[PDB]
Design a protein around this motif. Structure first.
Motif, PDB file in Angstrom:
ATOM      1  N   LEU A 161      -4.538   9.240  12.503  1.00 46.21           N
ATOM      2  CA  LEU A 161      -3.249   9.682  12.012  1.00 46.21           C
ATOM      3  C   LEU A 161      -2.641  10.789  12.857  1.00 46.21           C
ATOM      4  O   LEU A 161      -3.320  11.671  13.332  1.00 46.21           O
ATOM      5  CB  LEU A 161      -3.369  10.169  10.557  1.00 46.21           C
ATOM      6  N   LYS A 168       7.222  -0.257   6.719  1.00 46.62           N
ATOM      7  CA  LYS A 168       7.669   0.624   5.631  1.00 46.62           C
ATOM      8  C   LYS A 168       8.726  -0.147   4.756  1.00 46.62           C
ATOM      9  O   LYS A 168       9.734  -0.524   5.246  1.00 46.62           O
ATOM     10  CB  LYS A 168       8.253   1.964   6.176  1.00 46.62           C
ATOM     11  N   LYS A 196       0.847  -1.192   0.000  1.00 42.17           N
ATOM     12  CA  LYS A 196       0.000   0.000   0.000  1.00 42.17           C
ATOM     13  C   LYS A 196       0.891   1.255   0.000  1.00 42.17           C
ATOM     14  O   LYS A 196       2.048   1.224   0.457  1.00 42.17           O
ATOM     15  CB  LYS A 196      -0.937   0.057   1.248  1.00 42.17           C
ATOM     16  N   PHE A 225       1.486   6.596  12.050  1.00 42.57           N
ATOM     17  CA  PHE A 225       0.337   5.794  12.242  1.00 42.57           C
ATOM     18  C   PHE A 225       0.129   5.580  13.737  1.00 42.57           C
ATOM     19  O   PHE A 225       1.099   5.564  14.504  1.00 42.57           O
ATOM     20  CB  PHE A 225       0.600   4.470  11.560  1.00 42.57           C
ATOM     21  N   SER A 247      -4.129   2.983  -1.109  1.00 41.55           N
ATOM     22  CA  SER A 247      -3.611   3.770  -0.035  1.00 41.55           C
ATOM     23  C   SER A 247      -4.008   3.131   1.319  1.00 41.55           C
ATOM     24  O   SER A 247      -5.031   2.474   1.415  1.00 41.55           O
ATOM     25  CB  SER A 247      -4.137   5.205  -0.235  1.00 41.55           C
ATOM     26  N   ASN A 248      -3.182   3.264   2.352  1.00 39.60           N
ATOM     27  CA  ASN A 248      -3.478   2.696   3.669  1.00 39.60           C
ATOM     28  C   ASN A 248      -3.712   3.741   4.770  1.00 39.60           C
ATOM     29  O   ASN A 248      -3.526   3.420   5.949  1.00 39.60           O
ATOM     30  CB  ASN A 248      -2.375   1.768   4.137  1.00 39.60           C
ATOM     31  N   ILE A 249      -4.139   4.951   4.400  1.00 39.75           N
ATOM     32  CA  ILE A 249      -4.323   6.017   5.360  1.00 39.75           C
ATOM     33  C   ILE A 249      -5.766   6.184   5.903  1.00 39.75           C
ATOM     34  O   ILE A 249      -6.014   7.034   6.801  1.00 39.75           O
ATOM     35  CB  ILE A 249      -3.825   7.394   4.786  1.00 39.75           C
ATOM     36  N   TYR A 258       4.205   0.761   2.188  1.00 40.74           N
ATOM     37  CA  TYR A 258       4.136  -0.227   3.263  1.00 40.74           C
ATOM     38  C   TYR A 258       3.676  -1.597   2.784  1.00 40.74           C
ATOM     39  O   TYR A 258       2.876  -1.729   1.814  1.00 40.74           O
ATOM     40  CB  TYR A 258       3.158   0.251   4.305  1.00 40.74           C
ATOM     41  N   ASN A 277       2.493  -3.477   8.496  1.00 41.70           N
ATOM     42  CA  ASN A 277       2.965  -2.323   9.270  1.00 41.70           C
ATOM     43  C   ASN A 277       4.383  -1.981   8.970  1.00 41.70           C
ATOM     44  O   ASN A 277       4.932  -1.122   9.686  1.00 41.70           O
ATOM     45  CB  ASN A 277       2.927  -2.585  10.770  1.00 41.70           C
ATOM     46  N   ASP A 284       5.604   7.202   1.270  1.00 40.26           N
ATOM     47  CA  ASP A 284       6.069   5.899   1.639  1.00 40.26           C
ATOM     48  C   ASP A 284       5.188   4.770   1.136  1.00 40.26           C
ATOM     49  O   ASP A 284       4.039   4.970   0.721  1.00 40.26           O
ATOM     50  CB  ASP A 284       6.287   5.750   3.142  1.00 40.26           C
ATOM     51  N   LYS A 333       1.387   4.975   1.571  1.00 41.54           N
ATOM     52  CA  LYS A 333       1.138   5.946   2.580  1.00 41.54           C
ATOM     53  C   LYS A 333       1.439   7.392   2.123  1.00 41.54           C
ATOM     54  O   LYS A 333       2.572   7.872   2.190  1.00 41.54           O
ATOM     55  CB  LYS A 333       1.952   5.629   3.802  1.00 41.54           C
ATOM     56  N   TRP A 334       0.410   8.111   1.698  1.00 42.08           N
ATOM     57  CA  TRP A 334       0.598   9.415   1.129  1.00 42.08           C
ATOM     58  C   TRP A 334       1.325  10.318   2.094  1.00 42.08           C
ATOM     59  O   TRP A 334       1.117  10.218   3.262  1.00 42.08           O
ATOM     60  CB  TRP A 334      -0.774   9.957   0.854  1.00 42.08           C
TER      61      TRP A 334
END
Ligand SMILES: Nc1ncnc2c1ncn2[C@@H]1O[C@H](COP(=O)(O)OCCCCC[C@@H]2SC[C@@H]3NC(=O)N[C@@H]32)[C@@H](O)[C@H]1O
Ligand SMILES: Nc1ncnc2c1ncn2[C@@H]1O[C@H](COP(=O)(O)OCCCCC[C@@H]2SC[C@@H]3NC(=O)N[C@@H]32)[C@@H](O)[C@H]1O
Lengths: 322, 322
Positions: free
Chosen positions: A281, A186, A173, A322, A274-276, A181, A184, A179, A175-176
């Motif tokens: 956050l 990176k 995924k 996160f 995306s994973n956000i 991931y 969990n 990054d 991470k805007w």
């Protein structure tokens, strides 16, 4: 020796066929015997080369070392990259690229096996271990206005994620805005920078750092619970040349998309990747820190955020934990 | 020799007092006689030095050559500039600065007597004759977002114009966004560039080119009717060290203004100083060319333009011909 890269280059080029010592000797104008010594040295550094009497040599597998002679093939057949520079160890591919772009319009990338002064955002440290990751800077030359930096950064992300995805059996995924991931961990950090004036971008320099083969044991204790590598999610040996090749293929696909499409055409795709979403956050901006929910990504690439106090924000960038 | 700059430095520092050969010899730990030879060489290159028996030497006047040893004094007493680099001849102060800014946070400037590859905007040629102008690049480190580039460019302009004004008895005007004129002669061109990412400016690099002492005979026929020099408008000999000193004083005044004020506080002043009003302008943007009238400069620094077809435009930058 002087001739290692040239010999390696001939071997790569001749796959899947074998070439003879004799034939390699003729090409480079050196003795058969110097060709054998160069070949012995490559095996000793971990090249896997099949040598068969009467037939010659076949490169079967490269070690986790970058070789200029092989990278030279990647750029010859590349329509986007004029050249590359390859290093065993250096302060940072990003410094090197910012120095090499001056005074020309070339597009190129720089790779280094290790960095001794790897930097991510806000001058933070980026861990760049020898043999374990792709530490790369890419320089391109879009004819676009300096505000398009953000949008470049959105496209390239999908390119990188796609290239890592091809190799992990787990979900990858984004991470805007910076990054990549797997769960969990990176697995990659990237950063887009520019040289520009009111009239246009002079260069984009994209720094990309991808954890390829670390085991958990290999990461510093400080980051070990939030870091991972492609190998930890791939059942086959991860092959770095194969990865690089797919990475370059995707970067070019997404760079052409960037030049030809509005962000609106990839927005949904970016969203889905995306994973956000749906989680708390942590945001930092200079003094302030605050918590928040990512609500949406608008048609120009801004993150829509509802902070814990119910105020809405519209962000071109952020740093999120996160 | 090795010691020329050091001897020149001591001489500048000791003004308006005289220092003896003996005393200069003690400072640098060299012979009296090597001090005399260094001093003879400086006179021969056009330094005007008064040598009086029993008293020593007084630097009265420098030639149109930049000397690192004197520039070193300007930076020691400067709160903004960490250092400078000085060259007799080089490809471009702008290339040099873009190379020197990498990997540090220093603020500095670079001066060169001549440039062999001087560039203005859009890769156009900038004529940089030996001995005749100030060819300079300035690197600064504002903590600001990448969109503030335009506003920097507005402030610096008033700094440059003010410094030229102190020396011409004729009116000096700004031609937005990138040139300074006296009558119909362009006396200076400047250009603001940046290295940046979504998080901030890493460096501003301002290229400034000022015609100091050319006669009309000195400019290429192609530009001679639209170019001028400070000397052509100054009744006294134009002294380049005196100019540089005032230029640096203004750049720092305006740079602090930039960090502390909205464009709205200098807008009227910029307006009053500008020569783009009440006359037909030629605009170029890639394919198109069009004519137009400058109507106004808005509170964020955009030029308001009414084109010949009656359409209004709001421009962050342009290139204009008269
Ligand atoms: N190898 C790693 N794997 C997982 N976590 C790590 C690693 N190293 C450091 N970290 C953690 O991630 C943060 C990454 O920083 P970023 O500032 O988000 O940074 C975004 C990125 C930068 C890309 C770096 C590339 S490498 C090629 C090029 N050269 C260079 O100096 N940087 C770019 C660090 O503070 C640390 O927590
Ligand atoms: N000496 C001159 N005096 C008057 N007219 C001239 C001169 N040289 C060229 N020109 C004319 O002005 C145009 C200036 O270009 P600009 O692109 O508006 O450019 C804005 C500017 C650039 C600043 C140049 C500085 S010099 C220090 C630094 N290093 C470098 O390479 N450029 C900057 C040229 O096409 C030509 O018509």
């Amino acid at each position: 020796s002087k001739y290692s890269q040239d010999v390696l280059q001939l071997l790569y080029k001749n796959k899947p066929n074998y070439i003879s010592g004799q034939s390699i000797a003729e090409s480079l104008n050196i003795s058969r015997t110097a060709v054998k010594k160069v070949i012995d040295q490559l095996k000793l550094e971990g090249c896997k080369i099949d040598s068969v009497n009467h037939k010659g040599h076949l490169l079967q597998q490269l070690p986790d070392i970058w070789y200029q002679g092989i990278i030279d093939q990647y750029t010859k057949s590349s329509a986007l990259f004029d050249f590359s520079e390859v290093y065993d160890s250096i302060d940072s591919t990003q410094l090197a690229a910012k120095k090499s772009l001056v005074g020309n319009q070339s597009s190129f990338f720089i790779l280094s096996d290790e960095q001794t002064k790897g930097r991510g955002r806000f001058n933070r440290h980026w861990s760049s271990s020898k043999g374990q990751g792709l530490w790369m800077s890419v320089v391109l030359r879009p004819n676009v206005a300096f505000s398009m930096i953000s949008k470049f950064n959105l496209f390239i992300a999908l390119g990188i994620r796609d290239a890592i995805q091809h190799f992990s059996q787990d979900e990858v995924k984004v991470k805007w805005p910076n990054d990549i991931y797997i769960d969990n961990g990176k697995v990659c950090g990237f950063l887009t920078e520019m040289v520009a004036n009111n009239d246009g971008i002079e260069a984009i320099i994209c720094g990309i750092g991808i954890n390829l083969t670390q085991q958990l044991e290999n990461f510093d204790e400080s980051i070990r619970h939030r870091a991972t590598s492609i190998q930890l999610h791939d059942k086959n040996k991860l092959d770095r040349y194969q990865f690089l090749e797919r990475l370059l293929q995707e970067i070019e696909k997404r760079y052409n998309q960037f030049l030809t499409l509005p962000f609106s055409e990839i927005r949904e795709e970016y969203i889905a990747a995306s994973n956000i979403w749906n989680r708390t956050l942590l945001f930092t901006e200079n003094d302030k820190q605050f918590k928040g929910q990512a609500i949406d990504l608008d048609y120009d690439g801004y993150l829509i955020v509802r902070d814990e106090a119910g105020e809405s924000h519209r962000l071109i960038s952020a740093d999120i934990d996160f």
